[PDB]
């Protein structure tokens, strides 16, 4: 079995992971203690106790400690659950240098150990946010080490895009820039989602009153679930992660696809709806199902992917696509003529018990690169610029050893990359 590595970094990465692996266990019938193709993320041990390919890193021990008390404690390896003493406190200089140093060796040795547990190592996912100290600095350090030790393997990262209007941390704009700049050279593709757009979607589609991290995370976990499903299950067109890289990265550095999922609908709405292949596919290109708050009509599509799950047949897809391509309201780049790779998986999507989504016979994860993403760039570039013009909170990094002009150069690189989006769209 080809198997992949997962890493979870930061409160965000860990939380999402919590739900993610709960889901996986449910998708394979695995009990919370690991008790029994899943060998693509699990290692079967002597007792039928399958143990996950995942390393959890938390400098703020509280979060993993909760995981270590939580029901899936049994499942994970104590040597996988790697906790620190104090966190980076939303400081990249510590996450990527001062504090991150300590553990980063410990974690790498877990990773190498686990890599020798494996035969068919294919990719490795890294869950984190763009601004949380743990998530931010630490990730770029880690990725640089994995780009050395493995380098050939698929480097996947999930970094939650800092929602346009809505932020929790003040310096979050800083951290994103700096994190991103660094990890640009060590990451093969980076995913971004928006907590705000997702909130909007929970409300709009699922008919949710007030979203929180619990249910939001269940959503994300199902999106990831489909990606992996191409590996974990039989499908007509089985997509490997290596493929994902080939097809979703039009250009060496712009590997920053966004992804949505349909059907997102309450069990109630499912009875006033017949969700056909075409129905859903159409919904995938609705700006209101757009899980990053960036309306797709603001740019052109650089690339596409349809990870279809459940009862979906090649022609219905082909016809649905034909319909989509016919709709010329979906503008895509001259550069990229017909690139709509579709994945199709057979295995249906699955619903979490106590979950909030309609159990549907077919679903799809749409994934795309659009020039419209430059909008998101603009925002953060500017956000950062504003505070950097002040040196709001600059004392705080520059005491930690960070260089003025390093920050300027990092933002320069982000501006050059934004300028590259412009270049593609042309």
């Amino acid at each position: 079995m080809r198997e992949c590595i997962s890493i979870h970094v930061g409160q965000a990465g860990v939380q999402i992971g919590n739900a993610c692996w709960e889901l996986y266990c449910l998708e394979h019938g695995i009990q919370p203690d690991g008790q029994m193709s899943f060998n693509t993320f699990f290692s079967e041990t002597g007792a039928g106790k399958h143990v996950p390919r995942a390393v959890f890193v938390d400098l703020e021990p509280t979060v993993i400690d909760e995981v270590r008390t939580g029901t899936y404690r049994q499942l994970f390896h104590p040597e996988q659950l790697i906790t620190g003493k104090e966190d980076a406190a939303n400081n990249y200089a510590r996450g990527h240098y001062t504090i991150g140093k300590e553990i980063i060796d410990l974690v790498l040795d877990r990773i190498r150990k686990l890599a020798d547990q494996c035969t068919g190592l294919q990719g490795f996912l890294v869950f984190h946010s763009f601004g949380g100290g743990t998530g931010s600095g630490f990730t770029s350090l880690l990725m640089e080490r994995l780009s050395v030790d493995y380098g050939k393997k698929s480097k996947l990262e999930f970094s939650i895009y800092p929602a346009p209007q809505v932020s929790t941390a003040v310096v979050e704009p800083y951290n994103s820039i700096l994190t991103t700049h660094t990890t640009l050279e060590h990451s093969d593709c980076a995913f971004m989602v928006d907590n705000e757009a997702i909130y909007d979607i929970c409300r709009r589609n699922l008919d949710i009153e007030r979203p929180t991290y619990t249910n939001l995370n269940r959503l994300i976990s199902q999106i990831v679930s489909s990606i992996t499903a191409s590996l974990r299950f039989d499908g007509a067109l089985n997509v490997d992660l290596t493929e994902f890289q080939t097809n979703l990265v039009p250009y060496p550095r712009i590997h920053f696809p966004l992804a949505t999922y349909a059907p997102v609908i309450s069990a109630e709405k499912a009875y006033h709806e017949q969700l056909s292949v075409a129905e859903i596919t159409n919904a995938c290109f609705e700006p209101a199902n757009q899980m990053v708050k960036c309306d797709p009509r603001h740019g052109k599509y650089m690339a596409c992917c349809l990870l279809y799950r459940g009862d979906v047949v090649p022609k219905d897809v082909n016809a649905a696509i034909a319909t989509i391509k016919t709709k010329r309201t979906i503008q895509f780049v001259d550069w990229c003529p017909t690139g709509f790779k579709v994945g199709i998986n057979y295995q249906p999507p699955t619903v979490v018990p106590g979950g909030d989504l309609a159990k549907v016979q077919r679903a799809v994860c749409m994934l795309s690169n659009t020039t419209a993403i430059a909008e998101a760039w603009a925002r953060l570039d500017h956000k950062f610029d504003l505070m950097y013009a002040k040196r709001a909170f600059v004392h705080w990094y520059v005491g930690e050893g960070m260089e003025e002009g390093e920050f300027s150069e990092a933002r320069e690189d982000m501006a050059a990359l934004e300028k590259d989006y412009e270049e593609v769209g042309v």
Binding site: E66, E86, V170, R210, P211, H395
Partner: protein
């Protein structure tokens, strides 16, 4: 764990701390004998932060009592405290500084300081990861003001990378409780500003308003006022003492709330604030809770928060609630009230949520504002001080101890630079 250590200085300091440590003991189910009796696991999960277990259930508050005037502590340990606190920690002389900064800090206080520091070291040795020092004080009370200042200088020398912070009662802008209260304040501030990471600014006057008018309290004693102070202190630490959707450690909060080095002055907010009669007419929603948090009436420092701009605002919530609900509501507030937020920082809000409520309040939150408004309090002291300084009012008590006129000159000069910085950002 990450342990925090307290110091208590002055009548004010020791009195406030009296109830503070009572409150936390409630928060963790600790009885008056220092023996843990709580029910939930979270009651003592992180208990190590503030408690050292001395046997069985003996839990020892991590705190040192310091006062040159022995009757203070005598009353504290006469109360439902003395057997929680260990007698190693009662560090006291028998001589009052008699509200002479010059005494409590600079001359006699130093004697006591040495023995204090030794106990400090004891605690810092027993700690695993020392996360810092909270010191109760009155900014104008002689030994709270002064003695605390000396301890801080010393401790910061010996633990310069730790979070050190103080709760200093700022002189009520209308009524002075000491005739020389402006002297005690200005001096203290000189050294307090440069040697601390955070200082909380609070007025008894504002507290009175809150007690008597908002909470319709009939007879606002210090027990009830300190109940309020104890309050906001408790919340901050829930970030560390408990888990939550957004765990924001004290350091992380600090990092986010200090845009510039030295402007670390905080005006704790409070919610909910309404007397028992009126509670049946309202519903504790996040909108309600935040409306409370954004009230000038619920500002515990005597300052109108709508004078100037908020630099940064940390909304720390306690209890379960939706992240969309919170985020959205905070943003609604920032949009409507955008004239009160510093243009420097995009997303002037900052938030955190711990998933445990205080006391039996389903919803609660504590509001940490840093507004340029606060300059008025600095003016209060400056102005009063200045007048007295001109005439050399009560000069011979300080110069009697050997204090230089230029010491006071430089002290005010540094408060004038301080307010000048607030203006520049306003």
């Amino acid at each position: 764990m990450r342990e925090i250590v307290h110091i208590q200085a002055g009548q004010c300091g020791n009195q406030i701390g009296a109830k503070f440590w009572e409150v936390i003991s409630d928060e963790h189910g600790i009885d008056p004998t220092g023996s843990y009796h709580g029910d939930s696991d979270l009651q003592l999960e992180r208990i190590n932060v503030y408690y050292n277990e001395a046997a069985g259930n003996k839990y020892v508050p991590r705190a040192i009592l310091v006062d040159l005037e022995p009757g203070t502590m005598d009353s504290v340990r006469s109360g439902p405290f003395g057997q929680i606190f260990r007698p190693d920690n009662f560090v006291f002389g028998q001589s009052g500084a008699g509200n002479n900064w010059a005494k409590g800090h600079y001359t006699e206080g130093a004697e006591l300081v040495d023995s204090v520091l030794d106990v400090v070291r004891k605690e810092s040795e027993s700690c695993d990861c020392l996360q810092g020092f909270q010191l109760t004080h009155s900014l104008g009370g002689g030994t709270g003001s002064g003695m605390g200042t000396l301890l801080i200088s010393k401790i910061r020398e010996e633990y310069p990378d730790r979070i050190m912070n103080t709760f200093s009662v700022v002189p009520s802008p209308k009524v002075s409780d000491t005739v020389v209260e402006p002297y005690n304040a200005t001096l203290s501030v000189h050294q307090l500003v440069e040697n601390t990471d955070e200082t909380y600014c609070i007025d008894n006057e504002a507290l009175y308003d809150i007690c008597f008018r908002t909470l319709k309290l009939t007879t606002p004693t210090y027990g009830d006022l300190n109940h309020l102070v104890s309050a906001t202190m408790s919340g901050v630490t829930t970030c560390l003492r408990f888990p939550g959707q957004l765990n924001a450690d004290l350091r992380k909060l600090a990092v986010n709330m200090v845009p510039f080095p030295r402007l670390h002055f905080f005006m704790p907010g409070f919610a909910p604030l309404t007397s028992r009669g009126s509670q049946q007419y309202r519903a504790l929603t996040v909108p309600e809770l935040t409306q409370q948090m954004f009230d000038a009436k619920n500002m515990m420092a005597a300052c109108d928060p709508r004078h100037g701009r908020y630099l940064t605002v940390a909304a720390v919530f306690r209890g379960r609630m939706s992240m969309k609900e919170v985020d959205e509501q905070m943003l609604n507030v920032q949009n409507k009230n955008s004239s009160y937020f510093v243009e420097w920082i995009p997303n002037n809000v900052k938030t955190a949520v711990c998933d445990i409520p205080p006391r039996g309040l389903k919803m609660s939150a504590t509001f940490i504002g840093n507004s340029t408004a606060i300059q008025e309090l600095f003016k209060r002291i400056s102005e009063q001080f200045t007048a007295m300084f001109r005439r050399k009012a009560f000069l011979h008590w300080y110069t009697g101890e050997g204090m230089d006129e230029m010491e006071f000159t430089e002290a005010e000069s540094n408060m004038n630079d301080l307010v000048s910085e607030y203006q520049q950002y306003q």
